Coordinates of C-alpha atoms in Angstrom, one line a residue:
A1156 CA 89.7 98.6 109.8
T1157 CA 89.6 99.3 113.5
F1158 CA 87.4 102.1 115.0
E1159 CA 88.0 103.0 118.6
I1160 CA 84.9 104.8 119.9
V1161 CA 85.5 106.8 123.0
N1162 CA 82.9 108.6 125.2
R1163 CA 84.7 111.6 126.8
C1164 CA 81.2 113.1 127.6
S1165 CA 80.2 113.3 131.4
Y1166 CA 77.0 111.5 130.4
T1167 CA 76.4 107.9 129.1
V1168 CA 75.9 107.6 125.4
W1169 CA 74.8 104.6 123.4
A1170 CA 77.2 104.5 120.4
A1171 CA 75.7 103.1 117.1
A1172 CA 77.5 101.9 113.9
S1173 CA 75.5 101.0 110.7
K1174 CA 75.8 101.1 106.9
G1175 CA 72.0 101.7 106.6
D1176 CA 70.9 98.1 105.8
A1177 CA 73.2 96.3 108.4
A1178 CA 75.0 96.7 111.7
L1179 CA 78.7 97.4 111.7
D1180 CA 80.2 95.0 114.2
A1181 CA 77.7 94.6 117.1
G1182 CA 75.9 97.8 115.8
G1183 CA 75.6 99.4 119.2
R1184 CA 76.7 99.5 122.8
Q1185 CA 76.4 101.5 126.0
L1186 CA 79.4 103.8 126.7
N1187 CA 79.6 105.2 130.3
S1188 CA 81.8 108.3 130.7
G1189 CA 85.4 107.4 129.7
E1190 CA 84.5 104.0 128.2
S1191 CA 86.1 102.9 124.9
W1192 CA 84.6 100.4 122.4
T1193 CA 86.8 99.0 119.6
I1194 CA 84.9 97.7 116.5
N1195 CA 86.1 96.0 113.3
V1196 CA 84.7 97.4 110.0
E1197 CA 84.9 95.2 106.8
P1198 CA 87.3 96.8 104.3
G1199 CA 85.4 98.2 101.3
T1200 CA 82.5 99.4 103.6
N1201 CA 80.7 102.1 101.7
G1202 CA 78.4 104.7 103.5
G1203 CA 79.2 103.7 107.1
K1204 CA 78.0 106.0 109.9
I1205 CA 78.9 106.2 113.6
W1206 CA 76.7 108.3 116.0
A1207 CA 75.8 108.7 119.7
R1208 CA 72.4 108.3 121.1
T1209 CA 71.3 110.0 124.3
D1210 CA 68.8 109.1 127.1
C1211 CA 68.1 105.4 126.1
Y1212 CA 66.1 102.8 128.0
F1213 CA 66.6 99.2 126.8
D1214 CA 65.1 96.0 128.3
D1215 CA 67.0 92.6 128.5
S1216 CA 66.1 91.9 124.8
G1217 CA 68.0 95.2 123.7
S1218 CA 64.6 96.8 122.8
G1219 CA 63.8 100.3 123.9
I1220 CA 63.9 104.0 123.0
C1221 CA 66.5 106.9 122.8
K1222 CA 65.7 110.6 122.8
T1223 CA 68.3 111.2 120.0
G1224 CA 69.5 108.8 117.2
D1225 CA 67.1 106.0 117.9
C1226 CA 67.4 103.2 115.3
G1227 CA 63.9 101.6 115.4
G1228 CA 64.2 101.0 119.2
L1229 CA 67.2 98.6 119.1
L1230 CA 70.4 98.7 121.2
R1231 CA 72.3 97.1 118.2
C1232 CA 71.4 99.3 115.3
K1233 CA 70.8 97.7 111.8
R1234 CA 69.7 101.1 110.3
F1235 CA 70.5 104.8 110.7
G1236 CA 69.2 106.7 113.7
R1237 CA 66.5 109.3 114.0
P1238 CA 67.7 113.0 113.9
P1239 CA 69.1 114.9 115.5
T1240 CA 72.5 113.0 115.1
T1241 CA 76.0 114.3 114.7
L1242 CA 77.4 111.8 112.1
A1243 CA 80.9 110.3 111.6
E1244 CA 80.7 109.1 107.9
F1245 CA 83.2 106.9 106.1
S1246 CA 83.7 105.0 102.9
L1247 CA 86.7 102.6 103.1
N1248 CA 89.0 101.2 100.4
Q1249 CA 87.4 103.2 97.5
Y1250 CA 90.0 102.9 94.8
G1251 CA 92.8 102.7 97.3
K1252 CA 91.5 105.6 99.5
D1253 CA 89.4 106.0 102.7
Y1254 CA 86.9 109.0 102.8
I1255 CA 85.9 110.5 106.2
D1256 CA 83.7 113.4 107.2
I1257 CA 81.5 114.8 110.0
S1258 CA 78.0 115.9 108.9
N1259 CA 75.4 118.1 110.5
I1260 CA 72.9 117.3 107.6
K1261 CA 70.9 115.2 110.1
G1262 CA 71.4 117.8 112.9
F1263 CA 73.6 117.7 116.0
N1264 CA 73.2 115.9 119.3
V1265 CA 76.8 115.3 120.6
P1266 CA 80.1 117.1 119.9
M1267 CA 82.5 114.7 118.0
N1268 CA 86.1 114.3 116.8
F1269 CA 86.8 111.8 114.0
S1270 CA 90.6 111.3 113.6
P1271 CA 92.8 108.6 112.0
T1272 CA 95.0 106.6 114.4
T1273 CA 97.3 105.8 111.5
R1274 CA 99.4 108.2 109.5
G1275 CA 98.7 110.2 106.2
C1276 CA 95.7 112.5 106.9
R1277 CA 94.1 114.9 109.5
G1278 CA 91.0 114.5 111.6
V1279 CA 87.8 116.6 111.6
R1280 CA 85.9 117.9 114.6
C1281 CA 82.6 119.6 115.4
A1282 CA 82.9 120.4 119.1
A1283 CA 80.9 123.7 119.4
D1284 CA 77.9 124.2 121.7
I1285 CA 75.4 123.8 118.8
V1286 CA 72.7 122.6 121.2
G1287 CA 73.1 125.7 123.5
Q1288 CA 73.1 128.1 120.5
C1289 CA 70.5 126.2 118.4
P1290 CA 67.9 128.5 116.8
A1291 CA 64.5 128.1 118.6
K1292 CA 62.7 126.5 115.5
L1293 CA 65.4 123.8 115.3
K1294 CA 65.6 122.8 119.0
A1295 CA 64.5 119.2 119.5
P1296 CA 62.5 118.7 122.8
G1297 CA 64.4 115.4 123.3
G1298 CA 67.7 117.4 123.3
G1299 CA 69.8 118.3 120.2
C1300 CA 69.5 120.7 117.3
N1301 CA 67.5 119.4 114.2
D1302 CA 68.5 120.2 110.6
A1303 CA 66.0 122.3 108.7
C1304 CA 65.2 119.4 106.3
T1305 CA 64.0 117.3 109.2
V1306 CA 61.9 120.1 110.7
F1307 CA 60.4 121.8 107.6
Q1308 CA 60.4 119.1 104.9
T1309 CA 61.0 121.6 102.0
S1310 CA 62.8 121.0 98.6
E1311 CA 65.2 123.8 99.5
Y1312 CA 66.3 122.4 102.9
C1313 CA 66.3 118.7 101.8
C1314 CA 67.8 119.5 98.4
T1315 CA 65.2 117.2 96.8
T1316 CA 65.8 118.6 93.2
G1317 CA 69.7 118.4 93.5
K1318 CA 69.5 122.3 93.3
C1319 CA 69.6 124.1 96.7
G1320 CA 71.6 126.8 98.3
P1321 CA 72.8 127.5 101.8
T1322 CA 70.1 128.7 104.2
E1323 CA 69.9 130.8 107.4
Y1324 CA 69.7 127.4 109.1
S1325 CA 72.6 125.7 107.3
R1326 CA 74.8 128.8 107.9
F1327 CA 74.2 128.4 111.7
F1328 CA 75.7 124.8 111.6
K1329 CA 78.5 126.0 109.3
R1330 CA 79.4 129.1 111.4
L1331 CA 79.9 126.9 114.6
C1332 CA 81.4 123.8 112.7
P1333 CA 83.0 124.8 109.4
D1334 CA 84.6 121.3 109.1
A1335 CA 81.2 119.5 109.0
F1336 CA 78.7 119.3 106.1
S1337 CA 75.9 121.8 106.9
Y1338 CA 73.6 121.0 103.8
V1339 CA 73.5 118.4 101.0
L1340 CA 75.4 120.5 98.5
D1341 CA 77.9 122.1 101.0
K1342 CA 81.5 122.4 99.7
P1343 CA 82.8 119.0 100.7
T1344 CA 84.8 118.9 104.0
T1345 CA 85.6 115.2 103.2
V1346 CA 89.1 114.1 104.2
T1347 CA 91.1 111.6 102.0
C1348 CA 93.1 109.1 104.0
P1349 CA 95.2 106.1 102.9
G1350 CA 93.1 102.9 102.2
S1351 CA 92.8 100.7 105.3
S1352 CA 93.5 103.6 107.8
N1353 CA 92.3 103.1 111.4
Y1354 CA 90.3 105.7 113.3
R1355 CA 89.0 107.0 116.6
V1356 CA 85.6 108.7 117.1
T1357 CA 85.6 110.7 120.4
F1358 CA 82.3 112.0 121.8
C1359 CA 82.8 115.3 123.7
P1360 CA 86.4 115.7 122.6
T1361 CA 87.0 119.0 124.5
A1362 CA 84.6 118.9 127.6

């Protein structure tokens, strides 16, 4: 499957693609304002994530730091990034279907559109100013808006027991971005697409 990753933001982001224990394609790249990065994702990939990282410094070896979404200091991510990270999430060719969502479960750093480029399903978007409106307790100094699980580490926020409800914090993410997961047991906003669909992830899709 082909993912076109587009930075429409006015600022540079460092895109990242991982399935948690391995890079997808090169695993990460700098995207200046307007730049597009096309990656190939193995069919059958289960639990893939794409995210943006902000305010990175990397040396010539691809070792450094990002203020949001850092994946153990690498340019080319092998593992998931540190919150806060708006997440494009996908499972491909699962019994003939692709499954896509946007999640705020690990917080929000960059607005995002995740849309198929092929026919047969709709895209999802979380493009609200969640950072500007972020409740004081969830504001990350690095930039971005943390999820309550990351900040408070409670059974309720992290849904550790598999029993949890919506919270004042989850309802904030949900009010601004209804088409994104706000907590672990949120009513699924997953979109079902044809197996072997292709997709575009757009950072800052509106502004």
